[PDB]
Scaffold this motif. Structure first.
Motif: not given
Ligand SMILES: *C(=O)[C@H](CC(=O)C=C(C)C)[C@@H]1[C@@H](O)C[C@]2(CO)C3=CC[C@@H]4[C@](C)(CC[C@@H](OC(C)=O)[C@@]4(C)C(=O)O[C@H]4O[C@@H](CO)[C@H](O)[C@@H](O)[C@@H]4O)[C@H]3C[C@H](O)[C@@]12C
Lengths: 258, 27, 10
Positions: A123-124, A127-132
């Motif tokens: 999860r974290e 959350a932290s890396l899967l970003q545009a």
């Protein structure tokens, strides 16, 4: 891979080749996630529109490779399959939703400079890396340009290719296509105004989309190469199976065979 | 456990030729 | 294309 580069040796030591026994062919990419488990796209094995339904004895797994075509005599390892596991809700009928499969190896592989498992996200990290805007990396031995719709220039790589691609906002992913985009997918690639380009392509399916954590310096697999329309087309994007969202099912099959 | 740490790279603190591109994008 | 692989893999 379209518009990539040659990988360095050992740069992607979780890369696996899905290889057909007869006729001998590269089917797809795949990923080493432990000593006896490989992660791939379900469509690599099961695709009923084409009468594609591979079983365990249909296939070889080849680990440790760099060259697409040679037998890398004391470097690569070839393994047999004991069990294939496709997601129970993989949707081959419309959008390739839940495009994931596990394969358990007949015997555990030994790790080496060239053979080493990738991490799966928690999860974290997801959350932290899967970003545009954040880039990940795709690798494989698939075509160098598009395909079905076949091509010119170079065609098929000598050696493993690499490319690094930014993740794209979900809205622009859904607006680039007519297919129904689910939550079990994400898309990646450069926008037509950005000047870099690049993509996966046929024969790359099933392999890893990976990111390196900046917190603990490890590589994690965030995606599986799943689908795209064409390869490296302007204003088209590549679509990947979202590995953290299917992780419950992954843990389910590995814990209870295990 | 040692997943995700490559023998020829992280384990001997060498970088690959493009990993800085990744890391530079993480803001 | 593919080099031949050893027979004990088949
Ligand atoms: C993996 O190697 C490849 C995925 C990628 O390359 C990933 C990226 C570019 C980002 C896979 C490959 O394994 C086989 C595909 C998956 O199953 C595949 C097969 C047949 C395709 C496909 C399901 C996509 C839909 C459709 O194509 C299109 C463009 O609509 C389909 C069914 C197909 O028949 O191909 C199309 O062919 C062209 C030209 O003849 C025609 O214009 C279309 O009308 C026709 O539908 C596809 C998904 C995936 O990318 C593939 C290639």
């Amino acid at each position: 891979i379209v518009e990539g580069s040659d990988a360095e040796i050992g740069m992607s030591p979780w890369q696996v080749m899905l290889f057909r026994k007869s006729p001998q062919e590269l089917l797809c990419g795949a990923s080493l996630i432990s000593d006896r488990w490989v992660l791939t796209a379900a469509h690599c094995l099961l695709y009923p529109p084409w009468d594609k339904n591979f079983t365990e004895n249909d296939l070889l797994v080849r680990i440790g490779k760099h060259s697409r075509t040679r037998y890398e005599r004391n470097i690569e390892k070839i393994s047999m399959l004991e069990k294939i596991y496709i997601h129970p809700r993989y949707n081959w009928r419309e959008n390739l939703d839940r495009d994931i499969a596990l394969m358990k190896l007949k015997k555990p592989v030994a790790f080496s400079d060239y053979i080493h498992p990738v991490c799966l996200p928690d999860r974290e990290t997801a959350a932290s890396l899967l970003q545009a805007g954040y880039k990940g990396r795709v690798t494989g031995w698939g075509n160098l340009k598009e395909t079905w719709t076949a091509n010119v220039g170079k065609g098929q790589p000598s050696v493993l290719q690499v490319v690094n691609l930014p993740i794209v906002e979900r809205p622009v992913c859904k607006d680039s296509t007519r297919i129904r985009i689910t939550d079990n997918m994400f898309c990646a690639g450069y926008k037509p105004d950005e000047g870099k380009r690049g993509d996966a392509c046929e024969g790359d399916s099933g392999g890893p989309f990976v990111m390196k954590s900046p917190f603990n310096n490890r590589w994690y697999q965030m995606g599986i190469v799943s689908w795209g329309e064409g390869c490296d087309r302007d204003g088209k994007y590549g679509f990947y199976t979202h590995v953290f969202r299917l992780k419950k099912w992954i843990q389910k099959v590995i814990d209870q065979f295990g | 456990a040692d997943c995700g740490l490559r023998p020829l790279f992280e384990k001997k603190s060498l970088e690959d030729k493009t990993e800085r591109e990744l890391l530079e994008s993480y803001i | 294309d593919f080099e031949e692989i050893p027979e004990e893999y088949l």
